[PDB]
Structures are given as C-alpha cells and as structure tokens.
Design a protein around this ligand. Structure first.
Ligand SMILES: N#CCC(=O)N1CCSCC1
Lengths: 300, 237
C-alpha cells in the first residue's frame, strides 16, 4: 500500500483519487493520501473551490517512483513531483502517518470497480498519449484537445489518441467502398487491431483511458474518442467472441460508475442507440443494454 | 453547405459543378406471381448527371444485369450511383473535373463522399431545392436510349439543345425545370403542349422542339397554366 504525501493545502480544493473525492479547506492540515492499492494506475485530480473552471489531475503508478503533490503559488496549481531521495521520502511519509494527517484510500473489499475500469490501462501507454517524457506521471485537464481535434493548437499539450475516422482512406479500401463503410471489420481487425494497436488489450486500454478522462475532467475530445472506439466495434460484423464479451463488461462498469446527473453531456444518443439497437452487435452487449435501459431509458 | 433559394446564382458562375440525381437508377414494375404473392421486375435505369451552366448531360444507363444476385437493391443503387459518378470524374481531364457535386437527395451524401475520398477538394453538397429531374424519363429520346440498352452505356447529351446561343444559362435552367416540373405533374398534358403543332419539329440532334423565341414564351405560359391547374384539381381550389 503506497502513499502520495502533500507538502500542504494552501487553497480550498476538492481532491479526487480515482472514483473517490473529498473537500479540503484553505490551509487545512492535510498531508496526503495513504493505503493506495498497488497494481493499478491511479489518478489524483483537483477542482479549486474558487474556480470550478479547469478540473486537472495526474495519472500515475506508485511502482514507478515516489510522487508527492505541492501547491505552486506562481502557476496556481497543485503539482505532482517525484522525490528521488528515497530515505527523506520514507522518513517524511512516516511522520505524517504518525500524526494522522492523511486520508485513507477508501476501498471496500468486495469492490472491484477501479480494477474493472482500468483493467487494460497501462502507464506506458498513457505516456504515449500524453507526451511529457521527463516525468513518470501524466497531466491531463478539462481543456486539452486531441490530435484529431487539432486537425479540424499546441501539439506539446495535446492528447495523442489514435485517430479513427470512418470516412477516410485509412478506413476504406478502394473497390470495397460500400462494403467497408457498412461493415467496418477490415478497419477494426486489420488496420486498427493487427496494424496499430497490435492486440485487443491495447485497444481496450485506450478506450478505458478515454472514458476516464471524459468522466473525471469533462474532456470533450476524450468523450469523442471513447464513443468512436465503441462504434467501430459495434459497426463491425466480424469481431472475436472474447472481445465482444469483454467489451460488454467494460461498458457495463463505465455506465455503472457514471454520475446520473452527468449523463446528458457524457453520452451520445446517436452512438448508443445505433450500437444497442441497430448495429451488428445489437444483441451482443446484454449486460450493457440492461443497465442502460434501466438507468438511462430517456437517452433511448 | 446546402444549396437553396438564397445561393441560387452560384449554379451559373464559372466554377465547374454537377448535379447528380439518382431517382431513376433503380426502377421496378410490381406484379402478382402465380401463387398470388407480389414480386418485382427491374427495368433499365439511369444516373442523371448535369452541368447546369453548359447543359452537358452525362447519362449513365444502368442495365438490369447490375442487380443480378444482389441484395438490398435500393441501398446498393446509391452506392452504384456514387461509383459511376466517381468513375466519370476520374475519366475527365483535371481541368474538366467539377469543383462541386450537388446531390438532389441527402441519402447520396455518404455514398458519394466515400467514393470521392481521393478528391478531397471536390465539395459534395446537398440542396434544399425540390428539383424535377425524376421527370427525365419523360423526355422521349432519353427514355428510348435507356430502354433499348442491352449493356451498361454512357450517352452524352446537351439538355438545353441550342438554347444558349440565344439565352443565358440561368434562363435555360429555368426553362428546363419548368418543362420537367410540368412533365412530372401531368405528363400527358405537358407532352400534348410540346407536340400539338406538327409544323414545329425536334431536330435529330435535339431533345426538344425548335421553338422560336416568341413560341417559347407561349409554351412556357402554357406549362405554368398546366401546373397551376393541376394544383387546383389536386387540392380542389
Ligand atoms: N522538504 C521537503 C519535502 C516536502 O516539503 N514535503 C512535504 C510533504 S510532501 C513530501 C515532503
């Protein structure tokens, strides 16, 4: 069980850790988060009480280094940093733990939610989507645009998701125009899976990461990416059985976790109705269809 | 964006453009079978691809063999249209290729965009205009070449005959669409108007009769009256 110590909390802020969150008041004696489960990526995120504009946060994996958060009063945000002195780090973390100035990662033992949302998400792939090679953790915020968005403006601050475009030469073989547009199996299986992602696990990892950035930061380009990766599978007549069964589980837990009050802005009516009721896979997502129909029957 | 009443004059500027109408590509007769069920029999069709500035009509005849063994023919027809238009564009010299293609039905947008991915700078546009190009098969010489075809075939026409020697392309398109709207609303009466004078004939190299300027004014008035009359007969006005 690992720890993200904090220097202090000089400004009032709502802090998130994965799917949990809590309020810290201005200058409250708050020194961090302990008992963070080893084996998963995590995200620690922020929304200032005085300006809910800009949610921001950091993806990290405590197996890759000792990370702490200190507020920067010049740049006006809580920054993640790495401590390379392991001895000073341990000794400082212990002092805080003894004075009980840390919140405990509040995982219930029955609860596999975070595992289910991050099953295929790997820090090494996050760091290729979010390019900042001198840090082992990755910054994301509400306003970051995607490479695809930038085509239709700072590249160093972009989300380098894999570009999916259904009306593109990449998606359509010459002489198979109708076939490839109406059944996207070629584009899914040969172009994307075999060609770019190499396997379904990397594809699902980017899908899951895009959803999480949409949910935690309200990042619009991430929501577009999530829906495009769902629609590419649902619009393919030929998909491996294990991929459909895994996709049903992935989406079930995403829909389960979404805030009920945020569904009007995070769910695309056209894509979901197409996927659940018109597409080739309309009868393959039993768990997702059941939770969608009971939780969001208005959208459908 | 879409073509409507407000940007109408764009049709007659000097940027090459084509209208594509697919309404006569997939054509059937519906009949009863011996068992009393219903079946369809396809008949030859055509793609109507028109340059509104010059009158050049690229009439691609769709022979019924293209449907043999195919499913979902009304969907296929849109993609077959897009395939043939794309082939036409590729067959034209670069300086003759259109800068815009306007489809008369929105269901052609995706099929044509996908077939034209190699031409990113050719704009594929819908229109809000209700154009009467479905009535192209009421022009006798066009219907005749379509029905006689025994194989796929492209036939080139000027749908304005020699009108542009005397009138502008705006006026020629207005004449054409008035004629076609009349043939669509009451084909029998419209053809009676066009042909009731034996002394005015159709040149072998033309589609329409050789009316003088004064006679075209009378003809055009007669077509308006026909359209208004049918409008009242229909709605009881
Ligand atoms: N000095 C020093 C480091 C520091 O200010 N930290 C306070 C809490 S976070 C880890 C130690």
């Amino acid at each position: 069980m690992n720890t993200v110590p904090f220097t202090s909390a000089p400004i009032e802020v709502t802090i998130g850790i994965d799917q949990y969150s809590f309020n810290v008041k201005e200058n409250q004696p708050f020194h961090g988060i302990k008992d963070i489960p080893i084996g998963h990526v995590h995200v620690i995120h922020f929304q200032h009480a005085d300006n809910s504009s800009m949610r921001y946060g950091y993806w990290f994996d405590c197996r890759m280094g000792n990370f702490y958060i200190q507020y920067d009063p010049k740049d006006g945000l809580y920054k993640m940093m790495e401590e390379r002195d392991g001895a000073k780090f341990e000794n400082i973390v212990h002092n805080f733990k003894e004075r009980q100035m840390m919140v405990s990662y509040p995982k219930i033992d029955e609860d596999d939610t975070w595992y289910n949302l991050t099953e295929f998400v790997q820090m090494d792939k996050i760091r290729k989507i979010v390019r900042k090679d001198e840090n082992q953790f990755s910054y994301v915020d509400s306003s970051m645009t995607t490479v695809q968005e930038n085509e239709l403006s700072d590249p160093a601050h972009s989300l380098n998701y894999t570009v999916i475009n259904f009306k593109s030469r990449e998606a359509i073989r010459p002489g198979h125009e109708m076939e490839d547009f109406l059944d996207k199996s070629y584009y899914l299986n040969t172009v994307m899976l075999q060609g770019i992602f190499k396997n379904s696990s990397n594809y699902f990892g980017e899908l899951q990461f895009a959803f999480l950035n949409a949910m935690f930061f309200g990042n619009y380009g991430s929501s577009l990416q999530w829906h495009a990766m769902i629609e590419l599978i649902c619009s393919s007549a030929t998909v491996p059985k294990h991929m459909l069964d895994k996709l049903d589980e992935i989406l079930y837990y995403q829909i389960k976790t979404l805030p009920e009050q945020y569904s009007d802005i995070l769910l695309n009516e056209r894509v979901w109705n197409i996927c659940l009721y018109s597409s080739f896979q309309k009868n393959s997502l039993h768990n997702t269809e059941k939770i969608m129909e009971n939780k969001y029957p208005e959208l459908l | 964006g879409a073509m409507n009443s407000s940007n109408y004059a764009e049709l007659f500027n000097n940027d090459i453009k084509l209208f594509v109408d697919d309404t006569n590509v997939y054509r059937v007769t519906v009949h009863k079978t011996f068992e009393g069920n219903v079946a369809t029999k396809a008949i030859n069709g055509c793609i109507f691809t028109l340059n509104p500035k010059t009158g050049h009509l690229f009439l691609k005849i769709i022979h019924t063999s293209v449907w043999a063994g195919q499913k979902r023919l009304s969907q296929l027809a849109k993609w077959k249209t897009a395939e043939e238009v794309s082939a036409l564009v590729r067959s034209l010299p670069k300086e003759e290729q259109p800068k815009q293609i306007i489809v008369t039905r929105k269901a052609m947008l995706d099929p044509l965009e996908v077939h034209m991915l190699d031409f990113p700078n050719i704009a594929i546009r819908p229109t809000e205009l209700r154009l009467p190009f479905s009535a192209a098969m009421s022009i006798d010489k066009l219907s005749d070449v379509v029905m006689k075809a025994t194989e796929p075939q492209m036939v080139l026409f000027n749908i304005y005959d020699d009108w542009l020697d005397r009138i502008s392309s705006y006026t020629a398109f207005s004449r054409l669409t008035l004629l076609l709207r009349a043939l669509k609303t009451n084909e029998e009466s419209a053809k009676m108007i066009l042909l009731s004078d034996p002394t005015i004939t159709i040149k072998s190299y033309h589609l329409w009769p050789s009316f003088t300027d004064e006679q075209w004014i009378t003809i055009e008035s007669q077509m308006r009256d026909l359209i208004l009359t049918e409008y009242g007969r229909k709605y009881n006005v």
